[PDB]
Short mmCIF file of C-alpha atoms in Angstrom, two decimals:
data_model
loop_
_atom_site.label_atom_id
_atom_site.label_comp_id
_atom_site.label_asym_id
_atom_site.label_seq_id
_atom_site.Cartn_x
_atom_site.Cartn_y
_atom_site.Cartn_z
CA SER J 1 2.44 18.47 -3.67
CA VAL J 2 1.26 14.91 -3.21
CA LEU J 3 3.21 12.04 -1.54
CA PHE J 4 3.01 8.33 -2.32
CA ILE J 5 4.47 5.59 -0.08
CA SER J 6 3.95 1.84 0.42
CA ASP J 7 5.49 -1.31 1.81
CA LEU J 8 6.43 0.23 5.20
CA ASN J 9 5.52 -3.03 7.06
CA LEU J 10 5.18 -1.11 10.32
CA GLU J 11 5.51 -3.12 13.54
CA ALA J 12 6.56 -2.33 17.10
CA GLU J 13 9.76 -4.43 16.80
CA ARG J 14 11.07 -2.14 14.00
CA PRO J 15 11.29 1.20 15.86
CA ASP J 16 13.69 2.54 13.25
CA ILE J 17 10.93 2.29 10.61
CA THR J 18 8.47 3.75 13.14
CA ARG J 19 10.70 6.74 13.92
CA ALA J 20 11.37 7.33 10.18
CA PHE J 21 7.65 7.23 9.33
CA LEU J 22 6.59 9.53 12.20
CA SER J 23 9.26 12.11 11.33
CA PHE J 24 8.23 11.80 7.68
CA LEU J 25 4.68 12.66 8.79
CA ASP J 26 5.95 15.65 10.78
CA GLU J 27 8.43 17.03 8.24
CA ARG J 28 6.84 16.19 4.92
CA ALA J 29 3.21 14.95 5.03
CA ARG J 30 2.00 17.86 7.18
CA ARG J 31 2.89 20.34 4.44
CA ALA J 32 1.58 18.16 1.58
CA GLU J 33 -1.88 18.50 0.00
CA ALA J 34 -2.28 14.71 0.13
CA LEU J 35 -0.68 11.45 1.17
CA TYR J 36 -1.42 8.11 -0.50
CA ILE J 37 -0.31 4.83 1.10
CA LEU J 38 -0.47 1.99 -1.37
CA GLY J 39 -0.63 -1.15 0.72
CA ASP J 40 1.55 -3.07 3.20
CA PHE J 41 1.44 -0.12 5.55
CA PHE J 42 1.45 -2.59 8.49
CA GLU J 43 3.39 -5.85 8.56
CA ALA J 44 0.17 -7.68 9.63
CA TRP J 45 -3.45 -6.84 10.42
CA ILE J 46 -5.79 -9.25 12.15
CA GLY J 47 -8.77 -6.87 11.93
CA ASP J 48 -9.76 -3.49 13.40
CA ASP J 49 -11.35 -5.20 16.42
CA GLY J 50 -7.93 -6.54 17.37
CA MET J 51 -5.88 -3.32 17.22
CA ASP J 52 -3.09 -3.09 19.78
CA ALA J 53 -1.46 -0.03 21.33
CA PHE J 54 1.14 0.16 18.54
CA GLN J 55 -1.49 0.19 15.80
CA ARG J 56 -3.62 2.76 17.64
CA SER J 57 -0.56 5.05 18.01
CA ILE J 58 -0.16 5.05 14.21
CA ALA J 59 -3.87 5.95 13.75
CA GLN J 60 -3.36 8.84 16.21
CA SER J 61 -0.33 10.08 14.30
CA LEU J 62 -2.13 9.89 10.93
CA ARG J 63 -5.08 11.71 12.49
CA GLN J 64 -2.93 14.65 13.62
CA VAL J 65 -1.82 15.08 10.00
CA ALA J 66 -5.37 14.70 8.63
CA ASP J 67 -6.73 17.23 11.18
CA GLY J 68 -4.16 19.74 9.91
CA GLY J 69 -5.68 19.64 6.41
CA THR J 70 -3.65 16.99 4.54
CA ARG J 71 -5.91 14.44 2.81
CA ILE J 72 -4.78 10.91 3.55
CA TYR J 73 -5.74 7.81 1.50
CA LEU J 74 -5.00 4.25 2.38
CA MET J 75 -5.14 1.18 0.12
CA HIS J 76 -4.85 -2.51 1.13
CA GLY J 77 -1.77 -4.62 0.46
CA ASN J 78 -1.25 -8.36 0.72
CA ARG J 79 -0.28 -8.06 4.40
CA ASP J 80 -2.91 -5.64 5.71
CA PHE J 81 -5.95 -6.21 3.51
CA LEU J 82 -8.19 -6.57 6.63
CA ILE J 83 -7.74 -2.88 7.52
CA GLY J 84 -11.27 -1.46 7.87
CA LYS J 85 -13.51 1.61 8.04
CA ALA J 86 -13.13 1.76 11.83
CA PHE J 87 -9.38 2.15 11.63
CA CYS J 88 -9.77 4.71 8.86
CA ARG J 89 -12.25 6.77 10.92
CA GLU J 90 -9.76 6.81 13.86
CA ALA J 91 -6.92 7.80 11.54
CA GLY J 92 -8.98 10.36 9.64
CA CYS J 93 -8.09 8.74 6.29
CA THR J 94 -10.09 7.52 3.29
CA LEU J 95 -9.96 3.79 2.43
CA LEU J 96 -9.39 3.42 -1.33
CA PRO J 97 -10.20 0.18 -3.12
CA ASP J 98 -7.56 -1.55 -5.24
CA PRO J 99 -7.70 -0.44 -8.02
CA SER J 100 -8.53 3.24 -7.81
CA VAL J 101 -8.21 6.00 -10.41
CA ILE J 102 -7.55 9.50 -9.03
CA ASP J 103 -7.17 12.94 -10.55
CA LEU J 104 -3.61 14.10 -10.16
CA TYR J 105 -3.01 17.67 -11.35
CA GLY J 106 -5.64 17.19 -14.08
CA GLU J 107 -4.48 13.72 -15.25
CA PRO J 108 -6.23 10.38 -14.49
CA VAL J 109 -3.75 8.10 -12.60
CA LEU J 110 -4.29 4.42 -11.71
CA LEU J 111 -3.20 3.31 -8.22
CA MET J 112 -2.81 -0.32 -7.09
CA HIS J 113 -0.89 -2.13 -4.43
CA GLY J 114 0.74 -4.11 -7.31
CA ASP J 115 0.34 -7.77 -6.25
CA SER J 116 -2.65 -8.21 -8.58
CA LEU J 117 -0.26 -7.68 -11.54
CA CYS J 118 2.05 -10.49 -10.39
CA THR J 119 0.00 -13.17 -12.12
CA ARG J 120 2.83 -15.67 -12.72
CA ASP J 121 2.64 -16.60 -9.02
CA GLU J 122 -0.29 -18.91 -9.60
CA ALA J 123 -0.53 -20.25 -6.05
CA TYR J 124 -0.68 -16.74 -4.68
CA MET J 125 -3.30 -15.63 -7.26
CA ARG J 126 -5.59 -18.45 -5.99
CA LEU J 127 -5.01 -17.52 -2.32
CA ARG J 128 -5.56 -13.83 -2.97
CA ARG J 129 -8.84 -14.70 -4.72
CA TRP J 130 -10.01 -16.61 -1.63
CA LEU J 131 -8.94 -13.89 0.85
CA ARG J 132 -10.74 -11.11 -1.05
CA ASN J 133 -13.96 -13.09 -1.49
CA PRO J 134 -16.80 -11.35 0.42
CA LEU J 135 -17.83 -14.74 1.80
CA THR J 136 -14.34 -15.29 3.20
CA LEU J 137 -14.42 -11.84 4.73
CA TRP J 138 -17.78 -12.62 6.31
CA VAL J 139 -16.55 -15.85 7.82
CA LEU J 140 -13.33 -14.19 9.04
CA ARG J 141 -15.50 -11.54 10.73
CA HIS J 142 -17.28 -14.25 12.65
CA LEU J 143 -14.15 -16.10 13.87
CA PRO J 144 -12.82 -15.33 17.37
CA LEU J 145 -9.51 -13.41 17.46
CA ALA J 146 -7.57 -16.48 18.69
CA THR J 147 -8.80 -18.49 15.71
CA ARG J 148 -7.91 -15.69 13.29
CA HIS J 149 -4.40 -15.68 14.78
CA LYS J 150 -4.35 -19.44 14.34
CA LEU J 151 -5.26 -18.96 10.67
CA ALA J 152 -2.65 -16.21 10.19
CA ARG J 153 0.01 -18.53 11.59
CA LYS J 154 -1.13 -21.35 9.32
CA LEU J 155 -1.05 -19.13 6.23
CA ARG J 156 2.33 -17.72 7.26
CA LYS J 157 3.60 -21.31 7.30
CA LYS J 158 14.31 -10.62 -0.52
CA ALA J 159 13.07 -8.53 -3.47
CA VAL J 160 14.55 -11.09 -5.91
CA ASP J 161 12.25 -13.74 -4.37
CA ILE J 162 9.12 -11.56 -4.74
CA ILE J 163 7.51 -12.41 -8.09
CA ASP J 164 7.51 -9.28 -10.29
CA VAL J 165 4.63 -7.99 -12.46
CA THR J 166 3.56 -9.82 -15.60
CA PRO J 167 4.67 -7.38 -18.32
CA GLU J 168 1.58 -7.69 -20.52
CA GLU J 169 -0.80 -7.08 -17.59
CA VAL J 170 0.48 -3.52 -17.29
CA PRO J 171 -0.78 -2.07 -20.58
CA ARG J 172 -3.91 -4.22 -20.31
CA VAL J 173 -5.03 -2.66 -17.00
CA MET J 174 -3.88 0.86 -17.86
CA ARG J 175 -5.76 0.77 -21.14
CA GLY J 176 -8.91 -0.53 -19.43
CA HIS J 177 -8.84 2.31 -16.89
CA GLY J 178 -8.12 5.01 -19.48
CA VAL J 179 -4.83 6.13 -17.89
CA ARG J 180 -1.25 6.82 -19.02
CA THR J 181 0.24 6.70 -15.47
CA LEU J 182 0.20 3.78 -13.00
CA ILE J 183 1.75 3.96 -9.49
CA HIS J 184 2.09 0.78 -7.42
CA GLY J 185 4.20 -0.89 -4.77
CA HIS J 186 4.51 -4.52 -3.66
CA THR J 187 7.48 -5.62 -5.83
CA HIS J 188 10.22 -3.81 -3.83
CA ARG J 189 11.78 -2.62 -7.11
CA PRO J 190 11.46 1.17 -7.11
CA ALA J 191 11.77 2.63 -10.63
CA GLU J 192 10.01 4.48 -13.36
CA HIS J 193 9.31 2.44 -16.54
CA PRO J 194 8.10 4.00 -19.77
CA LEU J 195 5.75 2.11 -22.12
CA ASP J 196 3.50 2.87 -25.10
CA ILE J 197 -0.29 2.38 -25.13
CA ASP J 198 -1.95 2.65 -28.53
CA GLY J 199 0.79 4.98 -29.74
CA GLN J 200 0.81 7.30 -26.68
CA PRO J 201 3.62 7.40 -24.09
CA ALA J 202 2.73 6.06 -20.64
CA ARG J 203 4.63 5.34 -17.41
CA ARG J 204 4.60 2.91 -14.51
CA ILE J 205 6.19 4.15 -11.28
CA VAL J 206 7.05 1.56 -8.61
CA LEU J 207 7.42 2.65 -4.94
CA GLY J 208 10.27 1.49 -2.68
CA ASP J 209 9.90 -0.61 0.51
CA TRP J 210 11.16 0.63 3.90
CA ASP J 211 13.08 -2.38 5.23
CA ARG J 212 16.50 -0.74 4.96
CA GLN J 213 15.75 2.90 4.15
CA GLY J 214 12.67 5.08 3.74
CA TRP J 215 11.19 5.98 0.33
CA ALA J 216 8.78 8.65 -0.93
CA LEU J 217 7.52 9.67 -4.36
CA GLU J 218 6.58 13.35 -4.38
CA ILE J 219 4.63 14.88 -7.25
CA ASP J 220 3.60 18.46 -7.90
CA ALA J 221 2.23 20.27 -10.92
CA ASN J 222 5.71 20.67 -12.42
CA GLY J 223 7.25 17.26 -11.99
CA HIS J 224 8.06 14.51 -9.54
CA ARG J 225 10.86 12.69 -7.76
CA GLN J 226 11.17 9.42 -5.83
CA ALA J 227 14.25 9.18 -3.54
CA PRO J 228 15.38 7.22 -0.52
CA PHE J 229 16.25 8.65 2.87
CA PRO J 230 17.87 7.04 5.96
CA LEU J 231 15.65 5.45 8.62
CA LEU J 232 17.82 6.85 11.43
#
């Protein structure tokens, strides 16, 4: 089977989420063929050069799972888009771009964090565009850590208040990628939504966020299920 999770927002000051995630690795991800993490894995990320002990402990725990044979894939979210190849090498995972199409039991499946669909938030679309620009990334690379923290603070300054996807964007992007299944996170509204693309049934599955309870979507060749479980 294959596991999909997102929107954990890991941080040292939420040890309930940390304990839930680490046990999830031990009890479920170890036995899975693959684990996909679709963005907002960490609550913040200043860059791989600035990893602290907490963030390195999570790389170590991923790496134990990867060394045991489970393939792990990590995709950026709005909070942790500066995660890099160095972190992924430590963790033994593969960094997937947003968007990515994978083969899932013989079907092409589109994966995204989900914020790029939320196009009604115009201010955020403009900021996201700047943050993802290679030139921005280059300049960020060349800023000292302190100044990057200064910028994070400046930029920093419930689900209902997170803008949800633009409905029409969903079939548009699924059609363009040649898929009938999309899995994403970001909106904190876990669900499965059917839709129709050019007369064929399709589905959009939204992953749950871990602020109150853990979530995982598990898929095998015979079906799938997303359900919550307690953090403690």
